[PDB]
Structures are given as C-alpha cells and as structure tokens.
C-alpha cells in the first residue's frame, strides 16, 4: 500500500496523462500521494 495508495485509484492514459482518483473523497488528484 506504500508504492501505491490503497484507498486510491489509477487512471493511466497512454496519451500521457497520469491522473488518479481518491476513492475516499471521490476527488481527482494529479499529484503523487507519496510526494506529499
């Protein structure tokens, strides 16, 4: 759960957009949760 948040979602687009969901808040975070 450290290398990838567990209450967390991955939406990786081959177009070059790594945007992630927070399944807890229903919020979309572009920011790496491990950086802060």
């Amino acid at each position: 759960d450290v290398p990838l948040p567990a209450g967390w979602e991955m939406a990786k687009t081959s177009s070059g957009q790594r945007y992630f969901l927070n399944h807890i808040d229903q919020t979309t975070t572009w920011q790496d949760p491990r950086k802060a």
Binding site: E9, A11, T13, Q17, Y19, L21, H23, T28
Partner: peptide, 9 residues
C-alpha cells in the same frame, strides 16, 4: 477499479 474522465481533458 473505476475509470472516470481526465479532470483537464
């Protein structure tokens, strides 16, 4: 587990 749409599409 779920696919939304890019917030900056």
């Amino acid at each position: 587990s779920t696919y939304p749409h890019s917030p900056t599409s």
